[PDB]
Enzyme design. Structure first.
Site, PDB file in Angstrom:
ATOM      1  N   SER A 125       0.839  -1.198  -0.066  1.00 27.84           N
ATOM      2  CA  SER A 125       0.001   0.020   0.166  1.00 27.84           C
ATOM      3  C   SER A 125       0.917   1.476   0.064  1.00 27.84           C
ATOM      4  O   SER A 125       0.031   2.414  -0.232  1.00 27.84           O
ATOM      5  CB  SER A 125      -0.944   0.002   1.055  1.00 27.84           C
ATOM      6  OG  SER A 125      -0.146  -0.335   2.483  1.00 27.84           O
ATOM      7  N   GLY A 129       2.128   0.678   9.310  1.00 34.02           N
ATOM      8  CA  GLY A 129       3.058   1.981   8.944  1.00 34.02           C
ATOM      9  C   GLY A 129       3.717   2.328   7.671  1.00 34.02           C
ATOM     10  O   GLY A 129       4.731   3.084   7.563  1.00 34.02           O
ATOM     11  N   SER A 130       3.142   1.584   6.560  1.00 34.81           N
ATOM     12  CA  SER A 130       3.943   1.741   5.384  1.00 34.81           C
ATOM     13  C   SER A 130       3.687   3.310   4.538  1.00 34.81           C
ATOM     14  O   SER A 130       4.535   3.966   4.191  1.00 34.81           O
ATOM     15  CB  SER A 130       3.398   0.869   4.179  1.00 34.81           C
ATOM     16  OG  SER A 130       2.212   1.151   3.805  1.00 34.81           O
ATOM     17  N   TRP A 131       2.240   3.753   5.140  1.00 36.17           N
ATOM     18  CA  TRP A 131       2.327   5.243   4.567  1.00 36.17           C
ATOM     19  C   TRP A 131       2.920   6.246   5.546  1.00 36.17           C
ATOM     20  O   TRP A 131       3.602   7.373   5.128  1.00 36.17           O
ATOM     21  CB  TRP A 131       0.700   5.755   4.788  1.00 36.17           C
ATOM     22  CG  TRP A 131      -0.197   5.334   3.614  1.00 36.17           C
ATOM     23  CD1 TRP A 131       0.175   4.007   2.486  1.00 36.17           C
ATOM     24  CD2 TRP A 131      -1.140   5.990   3.179  1.00 36.17           C
ATOM     25  NE1 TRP A 131      -0.834   4.444   1.791  1.00 36.17           N
ATOM     26  CE2 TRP A 131      -1.548   5.371   1.939  1.00 36.17           C
ATOM     27  CE3 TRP A 131      -2.049   7.007   3.542  1.00 36.17           C
ATOM     28  CZ2 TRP A 131      -2.976   5.735   1.284  1.00 36.17           C
ATOM     29  CZ3 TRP A 131      -3.079   7.465   2.903  1.00 36.17           C
ATOM     30  CH2 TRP A 131      -3.616   6.763   1.801  1.00 36.17           C
ATOM     31  N   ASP A 136      -2.769   4.305  15.638  1.00 33.62           N
ATOM     32  CA  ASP A 136      -3.413   3.184  15.469  1.00 33.62           C
ATOM     33  C   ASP A 136      -3.725   2.638  16.993  1.00 33.62           C
ATOM     34  O   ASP A 136      -3.060   2.752  17.738  1.00 33.62           O
ATOM     35  CB  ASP A 136      -2.564   1.922  14.586  1.00 33.62           C
ATOM     36  CG  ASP A 136      -3.630   1.148  14.012  1.00 33.62           C
ATOM     37  OD1 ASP A 136      -4.042   0.067  14.877  1.00 33.62           O
ATOM     38  OD2 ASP A 136      -3.938   1.363  12.834  1.00 33.62           O
ATOM     39  N   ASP A 150      -7.004   5.845  20.635  1.00 34.08           N
ATOM     40  CA  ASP A 150      -8.207   5.653  19.590  1.00 34.08           C
ATOM     41  C   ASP A 150      -8.403   6.933  19.285  1.00 34.08           C
ATOM     42  O   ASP A 150      -8.148   7.894  19.919  1.00 34.08           O
ATOM     43  CB  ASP A 150      -9.330   5.149  20.606  1.00 34.08           C
ATOM     44  CG  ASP A 150     -10.550   4.808  19.837  1.00 34.08           C
ATOM     45  OD1 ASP A 150     -10.938   5.789  19.041  1.00 34.08           O
ATOM     46  OD2 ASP A 150     -11.152   3.889  19.999  1.00 34.08           O
ATOM     47  N   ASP A 179      -5.223   5.511   5.439  1.00 37.46           N
ATOM     48  CA  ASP A 179      -5.276   4.198   4.514  1.00 37.46           C
ATOM     49  C   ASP A 179      -5.888   3.019   5.426  1.00 37.46           C
ATOM     50  O   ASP A 179      -5.816   2.004   4.934  1.00 37.46           O
ATOM     51  CB  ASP A 179      -3.864   4.120   4.209  1.00 37.46           C
ATOM     52  CG  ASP A 179      -4.011   2.667   3.034  1.00 37.46           C
ATOM     53  OD1 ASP A 179      -5.101   2.948   2.243  1.00 37.46           O
ATOM     54  OD2 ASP A 179      -3.203   1.926   3.120  1.00 37.46           O
ATOM     55  N   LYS A 197      -9.025   6.433   2.444  1.00 36.44           N
ATOM     56  CA  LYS A 197      -9.441   5.423   1.620  1.00 36.44           C
ATOM     57  C   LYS A 197     -10.820   4.984   1.750  1.00 36.44           C
ATOM     58  O   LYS A 197     -11.502   4.967   2.785  1.00 36.44           O
ATOM     59  CB  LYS A 197      -8.702   3.989   1.975  1.00 36.44           C
ATOM     60  CG  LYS A 197      -9.189   2.885   1.344  1.00 36.44           C
ATOM     61  CD  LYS A 197      -8.147   1.871   1.142  1.00 36.44           C
ATOM     62  CE  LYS A 197      -8.351   0.883   1.973  1.00 36.44           C
ATOM     63  NZ  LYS A 197      -7.089  -0.038   2.623  1.00 36.44           N
TER      64      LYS A 197
HETATM   65  C1  LIG Z   1      -6.036  -1.254   6.409  1.00 39.86           C
HETATM   66  S1  LIG Z   1      -5.182  -0.878   8.088  1.00 39.86           S
HETATM   67  C2  LIG Z   1      -4.333   0.575   7.683  1.00 39.86           C
HETATM   68  C3  LIG Z   1      -2.921   0.419   6.693  1.00 39.86           C
HETATM   69  C4  LIG Z   1      -1.893   1.520   6.851  1.00 39.86           C
HETATM   70  N1  LIG Z   1      -2.435   2.927   6.909  1.00 39.86           N
HETATM   71  C5  LIG Z   1      -0.874   1.108   5.887  1.00 39.86           C
HETATM   72  O1  LIG Z   1      -0.722   2.024   4.812  1.00 39.86           O
HETATM   73  O2  LIG Z   1       0.150   0.653   6.424  1.00 39.86           O
HETATM   74  C6  LIG Z   1      -6.522  -0.583   9.067  1.00 39.86           C
HETATM   75  C7  LIG Z   1      -5.969  -0.308  10.604  1.00 39.86           C
HETATM   76  O3  LIG Z   1      -7.103   0.825  11.047  1.00 39.86           O
HETATM   77  C8  LIG Z   1      -7.049   0.643  12.548  1.00 39.86           C
HETATM   78  N2  LIG Z   1      -8.193   1.223  13.205  1.00 39.86           N
HETATM   79  C9  LIG Z   1      -9.478   0.709  13.368  1.00 39.86           C
HETATM   80  N3  LIG Z   1     -10.132   1.313  14.044  1.00 39.86           N
HETATM   81  C10 LIG Z   1      -9.530   2.434  14.852  1.00 39.86           C
HETATM   82  C11 LIG Z   1      -9.713   3.219  15.685  1.00 39.86           C
HETATM   83  N4  LIG Z   1     -10.808   3.431  16.382  1.00 39.86           N
HETATM   84  N5  LIG Z   1      -8.556   3.988  16.090  1.00 39.86           N
HETATM   85  C12 LIG Z   1      -7.447   4.063  15.730  1.00 39.86           C
HETATM   86  N6  LIG Z   1      -7.215   2.739  14.672  1.00 39.86           N
HETATM   87  C13 LIG Z   1      -8.191   1.947  14.285  1.00 39.86           C
HETATM   88  C14 LIG Z   1      -6.680  -0.651  12.607  1.00 39.86           C
HETATM   89  O4  LIG Z   1      -5.838  -0.909  13.857  1.00 39.86           O
HETATM   90  C15 LIG Z   1      -5.797  -1.171  11.611  1.00 39.86           C
HETATM   91  O5  LIG Z   1      -4.324  -1.103  11.584  1.00 39.86           O
END
Ligand SMILES: C[S@@+](CC[C@H](N)C(=O)[O-])C[C@H]1O[C@@H](n2cnc3c(N)ncnc32)[C@H](O)[C@@H]1O
EC number: 2.1.1.205
Lengths: 231, 998
Positions: free
Chosen positions: A17, A47-49, A75, A91, A116, A156
């Site tokens: 990503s 963490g890639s972004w 996150d 959160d 993302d 996204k």
């Molecule tokens: C598709 S991944 C994100 C990919 C990331 N941005 C990357 O490009 O490497 C979805 C993320 O949303 C986070 N998430 C879901 N609900 C959350 C919340 N209420 N507060 C913080 N993070 C949340 C999950 O922990 C998960 O790591």
């Protein structure tokens, strides 16, 4: 499994990503600005972004534009540390998570907030799309504050049946709302990105943005402008 | 436009006094489930699917789905087409809904764990909620124990199950222990237990009184979507992304409160998920609803209902009844089922009889000749056992119907055979049967005996020369010929009237080795059709014609998994197959793709036999020094209420075009068509023109990866493509009475990278054609397919640039052959290949003429036109040429949700110009995935991922939207249209399939 999973390992990026945010910035160029200083990556795990943010803002920038630059990535899951990134395990709805993000900047609003995040799809499209709108809404209320007026917000989206509701729920708050696939976005995914340019005027277990944007909007759909992103 | 039928995700099902009510897309279907009759289809919601439904005792139906909820009368649902006016929209997603105890209110659980108490117009009276921070729910139910005892059971995304008391707004339990999000919660009726399931793949049983976890069940292999208690809370049933339905026992003891124990596993839906389940406790029947649109009825007592389904005997049990007569190392080596039970023979030639009535074994006789590796055969319907050995000896015995007395016996030795290694039998006519015997000496004869059914005497003996690579494996008789299955996929046909005639030899029918069954199917004119199965999974349907004989392959396919040991047609015309998947015996309905039964045999499964009995089959086999009898009864209810379609995305659809040929009269009320899915299969079926009802014939499995395209290129040829350069030309046969047949005619040569699209132009009379393919790496190849040598010759190759090429189309204008591509840069790119291929274009209707030159690989010329149209990839490409074939209008649908209309023209000098005629920038809310021109280019039907079907009109090169209509088919991605004689039929594909009329 593909090209980008391969070149992610070759470039040391935590996920394929990473190219979606790069191929995004191959226009809008919101990360090619020398004046760019403070960014927030929401739901960043793994963490890639945030790596892309790190490489663009520090490894690839003259020392002259590296001052007061600060990258915060949030996150609920814990993240492996990234050079030049403050990783918060919090959160995006919780108390001080806006107060604590407040402090790691000089009480300055962020230039740019990206997210993302997406849960694993179930295969039930109406549920998957609704849940994705939930994540965007809850992400939107931090971006409602910390974002500098006139600053871009990137997220996204699930580009399905009810996306046009999100676009006009989002009309009240931005100058130009754009929608983009990159090209590392798999053809077999309903994925796209809502690249919100020019943050415009916001407003002035209880009531949340999803119910107050549901309050005013209600049951209306508009079509956002579209923009391809890579070269 | 009017919606006619829909097959797709069915999210819930309920038993209700001899009805099944199924949430089926946005409809409720009401079935009489004992007869499997669809009583009515009633649309409840404008576009949302029905996620849940429940019935009051007095016939009111409460249904919800996403933000929709409705209360509707069962009597109206029984007779009305639609009740969408009663649909109400809640501001939040509705996770669950229950009637109040007295059915005077309804309780709505939102995804934020608030309960809305509403009146029966669905108007809110008040709201209940907990204190503390919000919870987001992926599941939950409201369980009504009494008028004032209502438990809200909430499954959060964070993996806690919150159980709280509705009216006091008081938390009872926070059940923690799961690792992922909670996708279902249910409570036992007797108030003892909670059950929850997650995407951690576990089921957790909780003590509702103490809030303690009692048991964790791990069986499902993917996420679990639904579960419930049944049989007075003694069992649990769950249903999963893994396509299985699993039954668990709740085992209660003093020393541990209760524990889950896996009991039965049923594989019942197509890849992938199962959403709904319900149990009828009285009959111990379950109903499941799948992403595939299948509604499956499951006999939960398949192994117990009649009480004789499973029986086993060791040699010691048998000796307890026959006496201590067996020698050291003596075991059962053959067995047959007859009306009375089993005849078996031991390794020492002891012939034993098991009576199905008395359950007793007894020694019948000993024939010491057959202590030398006896083989057992039989004619079940005539109670005739056939014993052979490796010393050319045969023993025939006939038994009385009920009595089992020996009433005829004959024995003989065949001097023609040194050593004998294979004996086959088959029925011949009303008075006799056939028996074949073979030896491994290449010079000895293949011997076929015709034997009387009445007194087991030999009527005639035939001796044939064996072809070179021939070892007989199965036998069938047809008229005066025997068809002998052999190794290496060979089939040898002999003539019983002339043993000097050269045998008709069909070599290499499939990649497999042993031919396992040959079964007559049907005959017409001077042709007969046979099913031929191969142990390695392949089955072929051959056509034998008397002109001397000739043959054609009408059908070829491979079973999904395992050894294929035989196949037959049942009384409904469905192809039933049986075999083994490693240690597991299967009986499988291959027409509708569901398993009928399964049994764990002896891994090696060296000795087994299957026999047809009234109301089912008996399977006999040896496992772990035991002789087992498994009776496989026909289900007490129909297998399905809907057979279903694919359970993954449908990427393409093609209807077999109308023809002047002799398509069989059975298909006259509808059309044969194909769906091509990301599940890697092509499904060939039929739909009725009036009702849109769909029937399955075949699921073709050659493709290794997800399908991209399938198109009937004429009335009997069809091309499909996937990735790994899989492109297959198929031939369809629709001349017989009950079903079409399809077989591979040739695969495209292969150079990883995908074939994104193709198009074909026919070479006039020939049945040869030109093929263009475009690939992920931007390459372009042009091929000549020639029928007689059945091969593809590469005549041109080139490259656009490096980006992907999504669509390609041949356009013939005047005397030019044009190739039009749509790269991901959003351009329309035109090539004029005429000068560089050995073919000519007829000026009108644009027919190719073969110059009959040798094959050189030309290079692709530089483009003659390059027009930018869309700002990104072009997902759909169509065109229509004018009456004089001097110009064509080209329609494009974009990933930029724009709709483009372009003009391709040749002037008097044959110069190509491509100019754009119109562009609707916001033609849809999301990706436009199909765009087809109809009515001579005057109209356009588009499909897009926003699930809005749009009808357009073109006036003076300009597009205007004239109609639109939503479909439940999520991720709408394929479209096919056929004219009736104009009124049109639309087939709409994505996740699901809908049939509409325009
Ligand atoms: C598709 S991944 C994100 C990919 C990331 N941005 C990357 O490009 O490497 C979805 C993320 O949303 C986070 N998430 C879901 N609900 C959350 C919340 N209420 N507060 C913080 N993070 C949340 C999950 O922990 C998960 O790591």
């Amino acid at each position: 499994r593909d090209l980008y999973y391969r070149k992610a390992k070759e470039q040391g990026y935590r996920a394929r990503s990473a190219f979606k945010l790069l191929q995004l910035n191959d226009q809008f160029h919101f990360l090619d600005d020398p004046n760019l200083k403070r960014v927030v990556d929401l739901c960043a795990a793994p963490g890639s972004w945030s790596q892309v943010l790190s490489r663009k803002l520090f490894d690839e920038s003259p020392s002259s534009d590296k001052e007061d630059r600060k990258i915060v990535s949030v996150d609920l899951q814990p993240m492996s540390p990234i050079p030049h990134v403050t990783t918060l395990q919090a959160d995006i709805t919780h108390p001080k998570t806006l107060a604590r993000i407040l402090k790691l900047f000089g009480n300055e609003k962020a230039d740019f907030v990206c997210s993302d995040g997406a849960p694993d799809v179930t295969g039930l499209h109406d549920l998957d799309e609704y849940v994705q709108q939930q994540l965007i809404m809850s992400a939107l209320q931090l971006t409602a504050c910390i974002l500098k007026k006139g600053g871009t917000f990137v997220a996204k989206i699930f580009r399905g049946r009810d996306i046009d509701m999100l676009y006009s729920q989002l009309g009240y708050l931005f100058d130009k709302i754009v929608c983009a696939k990159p090209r590392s976005s798999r053809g077999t995914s309903l994925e796209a990105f809502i690249v919100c340019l020019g943050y415009n005027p916001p407003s002035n277990n209880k009531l949340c943005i999803s119910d107050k944007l549901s309050h005013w909007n209600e049951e209306e759909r508009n079509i956002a402008e579209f923009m391809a992103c890579g070269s | 436009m009017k919606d006619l039928s829909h097959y797709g995700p069915a999210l819930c099902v309920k038993f209700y006094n001899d009805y099944v009510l199924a949430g089926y897309g946005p409809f409720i279907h009401v079935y009489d489930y004992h007869s499997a009759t669809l009583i009515n289809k009633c649309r409840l919601f404008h576009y949302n699917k029905v996620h849940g439904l429940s019935l009051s005792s007095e016939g009111k139906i409460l249904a919800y789905g996403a933000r929709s909820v409705t209360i509707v009368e069962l009597e109206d649902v029984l007779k009305k087409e639609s009740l969408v006016d009663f649909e109400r929209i809640n501001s939040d997603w509705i996770t669950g809904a229950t009637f109040s105890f007295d059915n005077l209110q309804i309780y709505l659980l939102t995804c934020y764990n608030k309960v809305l108490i509403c009146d029966l117009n669905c108007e809110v009276l008040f709201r209940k909620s907990l204190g503390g921070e919000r919870s987001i729910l992926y599941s939950g139910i409201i369980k009504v124990f009494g008028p004032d005892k209502v438990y809200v059971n909430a499954g959060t995304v964070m993996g806690g199950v919150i159980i709280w008391d509705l009216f006091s707004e008081t938390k009872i339990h926070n059940l923690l222990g799961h690792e992922g999000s909670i996708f279902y919660v249910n409570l036992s009726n007797n108030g003892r237990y909670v059950a929850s399931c997650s995407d951690d793949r576990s089921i957790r049983l909780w003590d509702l009184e103490t809030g303690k976890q009692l048991s964790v069940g791990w069986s499902h292999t993917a996420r679990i979507w639904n579960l419930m208690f049944f049989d007075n809370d003694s069992k649990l049933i769950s249903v999963s992304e893994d396509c299985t339905c699993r039954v668990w026992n709740i085992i209660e003891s003093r020393e541990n409160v209760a524990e889950l124990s896996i009991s039965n596993v049923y594989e019942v839906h197509l890849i992938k998920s199962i959403w709904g389940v319900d149990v009828k406790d009285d009959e111990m029947i379950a109903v499941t609803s799948g992403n595939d649109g299948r509604l499956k009825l499951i006999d939960l007592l398949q192994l117990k209902r009649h009480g004789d389904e499973e029986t086993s005997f060791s040699l010691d049990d048998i000796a307890k009844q026959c006496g201590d007569i067996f020698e050291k190392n003596e075991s059962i080596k053959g067995f047959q089922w007859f009306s009375f039970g089993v005849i078996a023979i031991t390794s020492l030639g002891k012939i034993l009889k098991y009576s199905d009535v008395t359950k007793q074994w007894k020694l019948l006789l000993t024939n010491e000749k057959f202590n030398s590796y006896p083989i057992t055969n039989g004619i079940q319907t005539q109670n005739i056992a056939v014993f052979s050995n490796n010393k050319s000896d045969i023993l025939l015995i006939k038994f009385s119907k009920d009595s089992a007395d020996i009433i005829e016996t004959e024995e003989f030795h065949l001097d023609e055979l040194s050593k004998t290694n294979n004996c086959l039998v088959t029925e011949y006519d009303d008075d006799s049967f056939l028996l074949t015997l073979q030896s491994p000496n290449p010079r000895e004869k293949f011997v076929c005996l015709e034997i009387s059914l009445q007194n087991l005497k030999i009527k005639s003996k035939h001796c044939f020369n064996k072809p070179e690579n021939f070892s007989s494996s199965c036998l069938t008789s047809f008229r005066n010929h025997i068809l002998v299955g052999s190794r290496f996929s060979t089939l040898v046909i002999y003539n019983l009237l002339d043993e000097s005639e050269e045998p008709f030899i069909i070599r290499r029918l499939s990649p497999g080795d042993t031919t396992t069954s040959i079964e007559f199917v049907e005959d017409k004119d001077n042709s007969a059709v046979f099913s031929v199965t191969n142990r390695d999974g392949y089955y072929v349907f051959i056509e034998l014609t008397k002109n001397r004989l000739s043959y054609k392959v009408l059908h070829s396919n491979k079973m999904m998994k395992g050894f294929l040991e035989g196949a037959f047609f049942n009384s409904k015309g469905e192809y039933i197959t049986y075999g083994f998947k490693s240690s597991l015996f299967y009986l499988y309905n291959e027409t509708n793709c569901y398993e009928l039964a399964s049994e764990v045999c002896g891994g090696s499964h060296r000795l087994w036999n299957l026999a047809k009995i009234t109301d089912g089959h008996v399977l006999m086999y040896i496992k772990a020094s035991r002789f087992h009898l498994r009776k496989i009864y026909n289900s007490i209810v129909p297998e399905t209420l809907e057979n279903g379609v694919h359970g993954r995305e449908i990427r393409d659809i093609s209807i077999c075009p109308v023809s002047n040929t002799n398509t069989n009269d059975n298909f006259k009320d509808g059309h044969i068509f194909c769906t091509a899915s990301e599940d890697t299969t092509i499904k060939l079926g039929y739909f009725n023109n009036r009702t849109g009802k769909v029937q399955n014939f075949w699921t073709q499995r050659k493709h290794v990866s997800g399908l991209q395209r399938c198109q009937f290129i004429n009335h009997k040829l069809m091309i499909s493509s996937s990735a790994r350069e899989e492109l297959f030309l198929w031939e369809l046969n629709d001349k017989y009475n009950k079903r079409p047949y399809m077989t591979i005619r040739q695969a495209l040569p292969v150079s990883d990278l995908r074939i994104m699209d193709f198009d074909v132009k026919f070479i006039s009379q020939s049945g040869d054609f030109l093929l263009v393919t475009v690939y992920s790496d931007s390459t372009i190849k042009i091929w000549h397919y020639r029928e007689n040598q059945n091969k593809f010759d590469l005549i041109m190759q080139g490259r656009y640039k490096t980006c992907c090429l999504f669509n390609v189309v041949f356009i013939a204008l005047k005397e030019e052959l044009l190739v039009v591509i749509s790269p991901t840069d959003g351009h329309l790119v035109v090539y004029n290949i005429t000068e560089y291929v050995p073919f000519s274009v007829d000026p009108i209707s644009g027919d190719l003429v073969d110059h009959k030159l040798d094959a050189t690989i030309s290079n692709l010329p530089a483009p003659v036109a390059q027009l930018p149209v869309h700002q990104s990839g072009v997902k759909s490409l169509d065109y229509v040429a004018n009456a004089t074939r001097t110009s064509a209008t080209i329609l494009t649908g974009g990933d930029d949700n724009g709709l483009g209309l372009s003009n391709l023209k040749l002037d008097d000098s044959n110069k190509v110009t491509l100019k754009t005629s119109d562009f609707i920038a916001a033609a849809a809310s999301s990706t436009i995935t199909s765009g087809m021109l109809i009515n001579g280019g005057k109209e356009v039907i588009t499909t897009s991922v926003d699930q809005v079907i749009r009808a357009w009109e073109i006036t003076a090169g300009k597009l205007s939207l004239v109609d639109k209509k939503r479909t439940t088919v999520a991720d709408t991605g394929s479209l096919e249209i056929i004219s009736n004689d104009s009124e049109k039929t639309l087939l709409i594909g994505g996740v699901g399939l809908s049939i509409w009329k325009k």
